[model samples]
Target chain A: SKPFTLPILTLGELTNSRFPLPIDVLYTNPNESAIVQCQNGRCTLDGELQGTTQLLPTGICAFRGKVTQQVQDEHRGTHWNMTVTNLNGTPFDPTEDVPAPLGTPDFSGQIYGVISQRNTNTNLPANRAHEAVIATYSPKFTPKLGNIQFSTWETQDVSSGQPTKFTPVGLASVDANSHFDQWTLPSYSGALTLNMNLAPSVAPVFPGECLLFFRSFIPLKGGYGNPAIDCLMPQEWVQHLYQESAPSLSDVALVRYVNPETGRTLFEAKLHRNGFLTVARNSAGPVVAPTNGYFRFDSWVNQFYTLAPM
Target chain B: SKPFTLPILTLGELTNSRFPLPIDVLYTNPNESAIVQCQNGRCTLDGELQGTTQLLPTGICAFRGKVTQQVQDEHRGTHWNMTVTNLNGTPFDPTEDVPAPLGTPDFSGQIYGVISQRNTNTVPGEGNLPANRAHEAVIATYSPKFTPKLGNIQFSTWETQDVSSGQPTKFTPVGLASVDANSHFDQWTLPSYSGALTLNMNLAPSVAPVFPGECLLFFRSFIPLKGGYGNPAIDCLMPQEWVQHLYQESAPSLSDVALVRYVNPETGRTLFEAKLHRNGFLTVARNSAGPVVAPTNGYFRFDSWVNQFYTLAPM
Candidate 1:
């Protein structure tokens, strides 16, 4: 009968409450690698087909939020337009935030936004492309604590900007990732607001890797605060960068994938200020053409990292 | 809106819908290994401390359902009792199902039921033990998908049946593992019912293990329907057992943990009919007392498995 401070636990808090040990951690720092896309039994960086992608640390961005469907009546008939607003917790500032590319339908900036279709859509065509659904949303987003959905949409025959065929996406129950406090499943409807929280994926530790026990901060090998650029760093390194302060680096360290068994370096690149990688070495031939901007890892060890260059 | 067949997506379905590849698979078969308890930063068998444990495939049992809260004012001022009924989409059949042992409260048989606290419990004591919370519910249950919650309950100061310190437990939204067909998050509160589904945890395939593509059924090396018992089998083999049938061994195969590199065996035991391990060779010297039943594994490769005595393979 008393109104108490109902602790709306995050996925992390909920998991921590039942098990003896921690199962998940908060993802801090946003960049290109933090944005990802999983489809056709594969996972890759978001906007993998569109050159390169990255999230701005400041200003307005669509890092996380819910997708909702809105009904609109045109001169033709009853039509629904899915708006990507209510970003983070407030209304999406389209006037200030990075606008979509020139001709693209204005929502292709973050093509990795994984949509969880909770509402029943039996009429949903089986041919609905995941790439299309993801392409339909903006500010590429991913949920922190759950089986990250990837194959919800089809990937084949991806006809990018077909206005005649657009999937109307909406948020019924917000993914329990961004918002930490709430009463019931926060109902977000009525506005064309695009919700976005710049929460990045700080690389999930797999069963193979031993969970880090203490606060181990490995400083950037170089000094901080020069012309610091963003790049994908291994989880172990990011764990350190977040804890220890190093204000001397002009840019984040350029990580190289060295085969532990073969001692052969596979790839090495530096993340540019705009979020794409400047590849210096690439011996391992990949299926996905990296000529555009390759800055994604399939394993749980790699993640997006950056040093704020003041 | 006409009632069309609503494809109520499982956690697996929802994920597969968004992602290109599969994220989770359905867990089949029941044995000592299926039951697990995660606490104090680790996971183990449901009744690891108890002698042995197993699930009865026949008759009635408590496997899966939602936990609900109710108020009462018998004597101690608004007293409440958390009941584990409404099992597996039906009412709890106390008469037919295997009862909890002797006098440890009728709810200790399956001690690994992970109770997710959806309802608010402002006065919830800091001393609530995960073991105790799990102990309070029957038929150890785990959800099909999502980040499985383990630390919601504490593990220290475990007072088994000290009624004075018993924590009132209930469920709100049913874990998305048991029933597949539902409109909204299935609600179960009315009857003093205990819901149970023998949905075993078929070890989750880690990122390391390559997700199996086609139906691969590796038959039990032994024969058809002798004195068939149950056991914990590796995920790879269970994938085979479920597809291919072979009437050979009197029991499920006893898997030995062998070091692929060093060629050294880690542990070997059999999951008896009663759901406990009968050790044949155990060399790992685990911190947990194997003298009881040491059949649980920390990896996604291990799971509960069995063979029906009557299932015979095609020639």
Candidate 2:
């Protein structure tokens, strides 16, 4: 047989086009705080950005995104929670469209609290039992933003001494509705059940007694029962107690003020009997509070409790 | 490394007288009935000789040698015997000299015999017994006048029967006594054992009565312990009765002439019981006069009852 040979060929060409590329989106428990940034319509966590932001001229509308949701609760002790979403002002399909290619939104800021001695009868009238900070997305955005963050605070007295403050430990991420999704809020009821059963031989008889305050931020109206907030704690301690049951002590209260026209929640600050200031100082100890006014303002109360227990 | 080589020599030079030659002797058993041939004063048995014999003559004298030791018992039933020392002649030693190297003494002849018989009492008399043959040796010219033919005869009879005119079986070349040496005669005695003990339980007893001319050859030489003659038969018949008692009747006897020496013990002469050859028939009837025999003829007779009871001791 003759020697066999193989065929060969060559080609050269070039082409280019512009098309939208699907991006990967991340869904986290509203209790998890994170930071986000966007450049040229692509979104990413601010610290994770690998390239420069795209520039745009004036009069051409630049679609900037906002942090959609934040929530916090403190049923057992002081805890801080927040969420940031829709950072690129992009539409997301419930099943398909992602956050963006470059700048995904996240919660990057921290909240601080203080501990104070407030009597249940005298100072209870002006006392606010809950506090919160929220980030909400526009309702017009597709696949409405339902993420939330929440925190709560509690207080206790030491014999022959000042009241002590207690900050929650093991504050991990939880899903928005306590459903079988990516992350969930830790329910006060569930936390109590876990702590009690963990030591069943000496089980606690009453779980609600230890809950001092609860708080949460939910985009859905009538927030507490909303499916989007099913597993989320109320953003303020007093609000959380009101959602589950009517506040018993006069020192507890719940505030639900929303701007009627813009549908934006209002921020109201107050010191209360079960507020972070009253709980943190009493539960952690007197030394955890700053020694001076300037230091007190600069030294964050959550940071102090975070290290005080250890 | 270096290669090595050795020198080679020619065959003609290697064959010189200076070179020593190796010699060896081979040993073997003699063949049956072969004569010894002598050459250059040394002699050896022919290929047919079965055993060694007396040596041969060389120049002026005869040399004698015999089979001194044997590996196996001599052919059974032949009454073969070997004497380590010379009983009739001077013995020769093989180690002292090589018998003059092929021109020495040789065997007179090969003696043959009926080496074995399965059962006794099968025949009667020396005539009816099987004959033995011989082979004469070859003599050398330089050897002295030596007759290399020595005759001998031996018979084995188990059954009782008459040997008269019917070719009294000739067994020639039997070993006979020489004039120079008186033959050595030896007899072995037997015991009077019960006949019943001799016949195995499985064998039938002999039914034939003792006849007048019948005879039996026994290894024993003593007269039997019991029995008589002339009661109802002739003297010739007495030995038959003796054999019957010794072999079948199981009786013991002593009153009769238990033994009679028919052959001369000294001269090795031949003997005969004339009663066996009377009437020109060579057979005596049941009631005939038994032959009156003597020991001078190299023969013997025992009462008929003697055969019935006899045993011999080991040499």
Candidate 3:
């Protein structure tokens, strides 16, 4: 009915309507004695090493950022040279401001939660909301060449006698802290940028509109700012249609602009719906079940996406 | 007139205490996240090694009877190869169940405090009080495989948990302690009955380093006899007039608060008649900081202990 115009996604509409990238981090284990690590068994009142277990741990890490500069193509082919810049948090901005379920990565020793981009309607972190996939990455530079998938752990309510329900909350990293004797001072405060590595060729396909759960730590504390055992969403979802390095694509239904005079169809991908929306790749038919992130990540999105118009 | 006789100490009087050896510890920093150290500046939330400044501390100690073969001399001179044999507490066991303070050495985390000697006292009035109670105070060096300079070190005034109920309380020195009274010894004394102890000393050059050898404050209590009624031979073992280590004012212009903590080993309870110290911050109790008095008071009040142990150590 209106004049069909070319479809384009501008910078303003892209950033203005959407939440910022590299979501802000909040404290999880806030106090000095906040996070705990065991060498073998329990620690003494003095935390001395008495027993026979000679296990150290995940190597130490710089701050949130790196003390070392990021280098591109450290080893070789088909890799993403990613360097995270400006990783500073003041009050520790959360994925969401108010209290509700969120699809945002939670770093707060403050509260338990999973980050979700879907619950955009609910300003704060929502309850029982299933987590949606945020930014996905792989260890860009590695001999093993692996992907550092992001996920959330279903934390238990400590108040409960038994850990019955999975409240979908917790920190998800895979790094152990260094020794306390020679290292580790108490009550911390600082910020930094880190060099994140990735190799898309060897990168694993992100399972569809699925759920992710960052899990526990490894014996060693290394990589990604001392990641302590993360990326553990055991129960996989169908798989987001968008593959690694795949240019963004959009849904014809939402991205369509038809001309009234000539009945011509001009496609402009609605980056978001209701001032927001999500991507599902294959939503060409009526059986389009447009679900959101978390709890039930089952949905059909024209997947309203694609970097350049095709 | 008092019995003009040499004060002899009994075994029961020394062991029948409710408070455990090295009385429970009071923390200046309450949590694990409390103690922090650095070489030059800020330490990573994860703590690491950068500059040479690697310091961590919370001077520690506790006590109990020992179990060992008391060798005459183990290694060499100036060394106390002292392995206690008479560690019988009540049952004189160096291990459990007692309320009285023992002359035992402390090293819970490998650090020592005051050294006690022969003692005798039971009730508010136990005979030959001070004379019978020989409380020796000293500050010893902390020798290890290697002697490294320890830093950010400070002491805290301690009291029984059952002694008081409320915010952490302790009696502070009238002013900064510039005296050497502690029988406190070096960490080397802790060679471990069959174990490990490392008290690293920060050998850094600074005008702020605090050496315990020059500063020691622990109240060794001993009550007096109740008109000879407290003497076991006199038909009484319960002493009267609890005349313990009640000292006051270490310097001039100082608030002479008689810091005293009274504990009836029989009831396993204690009372604080002094002020409290919170992370180095001093606070008064009962609208007062324990009855300010004088030195001739002979350390009668619950003497100050386990304070913030203020340290202005230079980085």
Candidate 4:
């Protein structure tokens, strides 16, 4: 199947002043229909998941951490849920090159899915083990070959139309380069596409996560540069994604994000998380040997490349 | 010389009520040094007599109506020199039962020699007269005697001392009876042999005008009266007389007398002039009996005989 091509995510304009966006993440389970609970290094399921999207025990989410994003996909009107967790880690320690997470794992974004009856009822063996896999990332680790990995396929009958919970294993430590770098789901390159032009008053695509994408690029070389070979860059970056939930008013949450290396904060934007990445690419360029080659590099090039999972 | 009984004068005790005195027989010379003048009906002095006796130039006396009294002794003191112009000739008014000389006469008194001299000396005079008759009384005439007769032998000198220019005159009709009825002089009498005592604050005699010999009678009758009349009645009466000189405190000339009488004019009992007769006597006898002896009458009796001149002078 052709990968869903997300629309070009234009960040509007680059203003020297403030912008509002979400800065936290939350995850929940699908098979058990409960919260992907984490306590003292152990991950378990809270047995109180109901059919509704509302958190079963509302207040418990805050105790864990804020739910940064909840992305749901539909195939022919059938729903698939993916929760992203962005934990607020410890303050950046100058002594340690890498700081540890602040509180316990914030089981904020746990994905749950109901499998197709064709795959669940026919393909499962009678005695095979039923296991579900989930993708997880932490702000502390180095960026891997594939930061986006699939969850372990489960043998259980996780049929569609019925709720199923999956708790992703392993604290996938995010790479230092990926710590706070901007995220851009290429046009038609990802498995899912999000409608950017939703209702202005509706919550953004990644409600609690900052999504960064390229607007235009400035080339380092003259005309005839390889456009495809050039690095994509953000024209304007947003830190808090859920900023304009009401379209016209200001955000209630005082969301803030900081770069780990330079200690620069992107307050209330959709692009950066606190104490994570430290660099970004410049989108303004001169035409070079190729259309995508030799783009203008930002003064703080390395400092601008960081991603924001907030 | 016989101690000439100058017309046995009769006078009642000083009372708040009014007693009628002959107005026709009273008179004053228009121009006599010590004498109070009678003009335009009312009689008052042209100048204040000595010893705090105030003279009214308007011819009214007491608090209201104007009249004067001889304030001193004869031959040595001041007398009221007044001209009586109107008088009935041979026969007086039979209807009124008045005798001859029933109208007016130029009258003078020996009492003025002492009283006027003392008051004129003490009280300042202010008026056209040089005798220090400081005040005048305003009088109204129902039927006043218009003709005035002057006599040269009946002259007296008014004492002169502190004199003021703006002497007060009676602008309102004065009530003759209102002349200090509760006078201090009526409280006691003097002894025949007791020469005039120095009238002092200690003596405090009542110098209010009284009939001749009434002073003697008061002492004789009230000899047993307690408090032994420490002061002469004559001196004690001076306060009431002094009050007459205080013209400013008296009722306004031609004005009301008391608050009631002033507001109500119909009460025919309005006062005109002060006529103090000095012929009443105090005796030990009852009403007329056998020989109504001279000094044997009751406690006191008033004489109805003798042509004693009643002086009408200013305050």
Candidate 5:
């Protein structure tokens, strides 16, 4: 029972200080046209008052709280695959990538491709495929899309007056993922087997594929589980109005009365949420009255007050 | 300021104001079984209660005060629409149709159709795929405990019912019920005025779901249930029971009650306990008693929402 060198720690304080920073913000991207501003710890991207960075810190800017590794094919195209050998036992390999999937209209990992262009093969290396990342892909809940017809059409011979740069192609109707599972295919094959590892369906199959699909997915970490969102009665309620007074020095029952003027003299008691005073003034008929809006009083620590009618 | 025409009324009469006439009833449906009786403003259509309306001073009988215009096509059918041009814009339009709507299932704006015989031509207006429409236009329930009084109902054969008379209605019920939450139908926002007035028809049935696209269902009367019927363990009812038990009144009563907490020996610093009475207002009983705490101690009020009787300080 000797005075052991107590490490003096709050039995609790954000799990004893291991808590997340006061929700922070950092400009990962800075620019006059495109930049990040974090407010309430939420960092975001926007521009000048033009097109509205006035939008202030915009919507959700999500990223993982935990670290993760990437999962791409032989460093292939946008067709990154998650090799799954079992339908049971943790559907995704958490060891390689983050496995955040939903049931139907489930999560599809994001798709992204650095887009660039080529001059032509006639000029040799100039015809070599060039690539550069144009933007970021943070699709939170994009549903899994089915076979989107991939096409290859480009301007050949730029020297022949045919020009080419970063081109975009788009279309398709959407429905619940359930539709694909029960569709009556024209070929009506029972089980569509993976004949072979899928090849990148975008670009390079035949010509200038400046536009390649940057594959992506939904980061809905709610499968074998999700985080426990504490349903706390917000800290605002547990708030108490503390005071120091003496039962011996105070008494003028603050109960049952009305001012002669316009409901003045704010004599109203407030119950804090999930909270109460260890020594509420008297008999819970407790009250604090100060003309300048400040409780100017002292405590005898053991004094008491009473308020109740049998 | 002149104290002009200050009217004085009250006490020294009727216990001088021992409120509430006795609970009453009416058979209306007079079948071999089934009756209508209301106690404390709540009325129910009951059976085996082939019971007749022995007492007439029922609690809350309804009266529609809002104005109404017809919307139903010249056809007298399910298309029974009332194109309300504001039922005269009165607070309750208590002079109109039975303002009862099916809330608390306790019967507020009771609806009824006119009793009639069907035939195509002899009454071309009464023609078309018809069953009943006129006499059954309105039926309702109301509360007398309120500042104003209420009443209005209809009687006729089930098959011969043709709701014709009271085409439109209005009123309000204030209490507790088995409601679906966060819905327009789940709660009531009492109007500022008390007499006949315009009723808002947000989420009023077909006006909400089903044939919604086809027609709109306006509310004649809507009441916020202060208690669930037959469930004394709930709102309004619980307090009624508690007060009765406290005052030693079984089929009896009290005025505005409070559940209290008392501190022991020291009396100054006291402890609070559970409870919230639905109502209050009391005069003291004197075998005489006075407080002995420091004359400086102040008053406090019970705060239920936060579950504490907070301070009367600068809140």
Candidate 6:
């Protein structure tokens, strides 16, 4: 009911905690963008935090509370557990009302990627490859009137035979509305999946490479994926991508998807005019492409992907 | 905002309106549930209104508004349009403020069908036919706290090599969670696309064949696509389908998807234990399945799908 946020933790705080942490914690990528990983006595971001040193980046920890498990180690004669009691610099007691911690629900896992039947990759057959849509639904039902703000995009898409990378074209309509001013969701909660059958029915579909922006108490990690994109890209860009056609080479920044730890380039991507991405394995030589393969990255090299000068 | 509901129009009202109504307007199916079709001077439900003569069935018209276009037929010197000024038995002025009619937003065209990657059809290879999730996302952003109620399922999945039909499955969670109390949605509005990165997120996923129920101002046309299933199926059944595993043979109702106008039975559906549906061509004969085919229906015959008798009209 109250405005919720997560406790911002620095790298020092995560290291000092009792729980074992992954070597690289959290990434700015869309797949695992806002996921918080907690165990035993500490919590951290999931999948190496990309593009920043701060563990809880800007707008990452909007809604507060974590699943704190009760533990009793009889053999070791010690017990431990982890939970969040603060968010966005404000301290609160999760146990103030309920016996169990009043944790905000986590819906990061429910959001999924969808390739639109409308937009297709020109390189692949029309029936096989289409434009991808980053799609999700309201995870729960709200009895009262409420609003939502959401944004997402394809930071990386190898699903196409071309293994293209999108820099975000713009945000537009689910179907096609020219004046698609962003001011609609389910007028009330519990109309999940954006049922057009219901009143205030808003379709939840967007350009796979564009972020969905909405107003909500919960902070969508990285504008629901990447805060850098959210922070850097102008509002017009988001609207442009959503309302206009798909992204072209100019919209894409030529960067190498590299392993942060090993500093090896997995692939260097080049955008074809046909909306297909041509990725070569660190060379101009001929290489075999994958059909249904995907790869993860912790950082980008030579990534000059800012709309304005740094 | 005021509580929204669509104006209930009986068949008589539609017939008497200035607009030419479609033959047998409206259906109780999920594809076109809760869709209000208006043109010229009159408005009615999209598809055939099944099992009832009432154009807007109970819970069918929740959030009331329509895209009434302004028409100017200079040739005939006629000027007219259609719009709703009342909802849920409440009358208000749509033109109280704005010069254009301040009609409630219409979002029926935005909803789409999705097959999940988790559930698979037994009739085909695991690589091909996966469980289909009726997936959708918030179409716009809201700056205020909000919630959502959604439920959908494979009322019919001919996508499977088997071509199956689901009577109803209990409603459940977007992901696996026991005691999945339906209370979480984007805590605020404009959290379009339900970002986990945001606060108060409740992932919207459900069994492909169940109706999602929630406290909503807008009527989810048929629970966001079938008022009959929403009416006949009990509340526990909604939760049960969501909480329990997928449906089996006993859960399915034996019915014939027959043509209302022609009185022709297209197919008789039977459910298999392995989650595959086997259908026949009205007889004990071999029939083909549609891999990428979907059929629209005006009515079902001998359909015994009520949890309670006469709660919804029988076919």
What are the lDDT figures for the candidates, one per model? 0.20, 0.19, 0.19, 0.19, 0.18, 0.20
* Model 1 error, position B103 (Å): 38
Model 1's DockQ?
Answer: 0.02
Candidate 2 ranges with C-alpha deviation above 4 Å: A1-182, A185-215, A219-310, B1-315
- Single out the weakest 10-residue window by summed lDDT for candidate 3 chain B: B240-249
* Model 6 / residue A29 / CA error / Å: 15
DockQ of 4: 0.00
What local lDDT score does residue B245 receive in model 5, on the 0 to 100 scale?
A: 21
lDDT of 1 by residue, B26-65 (tens): 2322222322221110111221111111111100111223
Scored by TM-score, the top model is 1
Comparing 3 and 6 by TM-score, which wins?
Answer: 6
* Each prediction's TM-score versus the true structure: 0.23, 0.11, 0.15, 0.13, 0.17, 0.17
Residues B17-72, candidate 6: write the lDDT tens digits. 11011111222222323222221111111111111011111111112222123233
lDDT of 2 by residue, B219-294 (tens): 1111110011101100111111111112212223332223232344466543432221100011221232222333
Better of 2 and 6 by lDDT: 6
lDDT of 1 by residue, A77-188 (tens): 2222233332222344434323221111211211222221222122322111121122222122222110011222232322222211111111111223222111111112
Q: What is the lDDT of candidate 3?
A: 0.19
How does candidate 1 score on lDDT? Answer: 0.20
Better of 1 and 6 by DockQ: 1
- What is residue B43's positional error in candidate 4, in angstroms? 99
lDDT of 6 by residue, A1-310 (tens): 2211112221111111111111112112223233221211111112111111111111121222221232333443211121233322234442232211111211212222222111123332222111122121333212121212222232322222211111111212222222211222222234442222221111112222221111111111111111111122111121122223332324233434344456555444432121112232222212232212222322222223321110
What is the alpha-carbon lDDT of model 5 when measured against the actual structure?
Answer: 0.18
- State which candidate has the highest DockQ: 1
Model 3 ranges with Cα > 4 A deviation: A1-310, B1-141, B150-315
Can you write out model 5's per-residue Cα lDDT over B36-155, one digit (the tens) per residue? Answer: 121222211110111111011111122223222223232223322221222122343334333222111222322221222122223334333222111212222122111121322222
Tens digits of per-residue lDDT for model 3, B1-315 = 211111111211111111111111111211112122212111121122122211110001122222122122222211221222221122233232211122222221212122222212223332322111101111122223211111111222121111111111111001111111232222112222222263322211111113231121111211111111110100001111010100001122122122234333444444323232211111222221112222211211234433334331211
| DockQ of each model vs. true complex | 0.02, 0.00, 0.00, 0.00, 0.00, 0.01
Per-residue CA lDDT of model 5 for A1-310, tens digit only, reads: 1111111111110010001101111001111131111111110101011100011010011110110122222433322111211111123332321112111111112111111122223312222111111111112121121111111111121121111121110001112321221111111011232111111111111111111110111111011111111101111111111111112222211222123244443322211111111111222211322212211122222212332221
